[PDB]
């Protein structure tokens, strides 16, 4: 077996590799990718996902999220205030100013000490899920606008057609946002490029390992745990590595900087955090493995974790023994 220890792996594919997007994700999990959960990949230095970023400002975050925290500095909940719209120009000076720059550190390590220590002291604003593309219409290599759409996957191995659009999403950042601890929807596949700006420190637990992560996360917030099975759907708890580390529960870290694409597979917990301003830009996306873990993948049902319009036929062809009752929790 490959990769037996879990660790994230790191890929330079070549130009030529990097042509067929499909065929180097099963090479990655050839070598065993997979089995951490989190690969970064380094595009070839010949690639480039756009010309320049000097003409960004003006993109709009309509609904930018201060991330209120609760509880203690290794184990809390955030929420998110709705804010007034604001322009990636705005945000930026906004990032760089005295009340939410970057402090000075001696690297990552010092900066990841800081950020466990002291967010929970602090309420970053995130610019988050916002509809859109910063790949040039000319970039033909991994362009996140123009992959394969999970519809077509599952009609392609199932035979079932459906509806639904699978677009991507841009993220702005500043220090000390702040992404907690999930698998993506229907435990499918992500993907996303950091286009711009300072780093993203992100944790992973392997995916033969998820269950002890969700049996911790029951035991340290108990009343979320009564509320919903399935409440890390809820994209709000955070865990640090020293309370995971004092409670055996296998994970790994890795940064990734601007220029890097990170793939998140079926199943994998992951979270993080912004090192300062920042944007990414991420997608969801399927494999013919991903099918067996879309059918098993779990559900909130309790309202509160509210998705995109294309889940649905997910569920219903998926596990149509839950749609009704995870419909209900949508309505
Ligand atoms: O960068 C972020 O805030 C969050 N992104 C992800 O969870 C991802 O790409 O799967
Ligand atoms: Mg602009
Ligand atoms: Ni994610
Ligand atoms: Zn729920």
Not at 59 to 68: E, K, N, Y
Not at 80 to 89: E, F, I, L, N, S
Not at 134 to 152: A, P, V, Y
Not at 233 to 248: D, F, Q
Request: include cysteine.
């Amino acid at each position: 077996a490959q990769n037996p220890n879990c660790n994230i792996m790191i890929f330079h594919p070549t130009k030529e590799e990097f042509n067929d997007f499909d065929k180097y994700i099963a090479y990655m999990e050839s070598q065993g990718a997979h089995r951490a959960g989190l690969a970064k990949i380094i595009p070839p230095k010949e690639w480039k996902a756009r010309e320049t970023y000097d003409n960004i400002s003006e993109i709009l975050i309509a609904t930018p999220l201060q991330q209120v925290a609760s509880g203690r500095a290794g184990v809390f909940t955030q929420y998110h205030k709705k804010k007034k719209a604001m322009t990636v120009g705005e945000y930026r000076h906004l990032a760089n100013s005295k009340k939410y720059q970057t402090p000075p550190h001696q690297n990552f390590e010092d900066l990841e000490r800081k950020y466990w220590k002291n967010r929970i002291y602090n309420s970053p604003i995130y610019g988050a899920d916002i509809s859109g593309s910063l790949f040039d219409e000319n970039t033909k290599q991994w362009n996140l606008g123009h992959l394969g759409t999970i519809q077509d996957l599952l009609e392609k191995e199932c035979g079932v057609v459906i509806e639904g659009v699978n677009t991507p999403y841009l993220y702005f950042g500043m220090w000390k946002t702040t992404f907690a601890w999930h698998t993506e929807d229907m435990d499918l596949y992500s993907i996303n490029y950091l286009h711009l700006g300072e780093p993203k420190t992100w944790y992973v637990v392997p995916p033969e390992h998820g269950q002890r992560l969700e049996r911790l996360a029951r035991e340290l917030f108990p009343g979320s745990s009564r509320g919903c099975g399935a409440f890390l759907r809820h994209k709000v708890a955070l865990i640090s590595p020293t309370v995971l580390k004092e409670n055996g529960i296998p994970f790994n870290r890795i940064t990734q900087e601007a220029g890097e694409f990170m793939v998140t597979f079926p199943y994998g917990y992951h979270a993080g955090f912004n090192h300062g301003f920042n944007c990414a830009e991420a997608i969801n996306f399927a494999t013919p493995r991903w099918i067996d873990y879309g059918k098993m993948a779990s559900q909130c049902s309790c309202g509160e974790a509210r998705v995109t319009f294309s889940m649905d036929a997910f569920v219903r062809i998926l596990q149509p023994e839950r749609y009704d009752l995870w419909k209900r929790g949508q309505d």
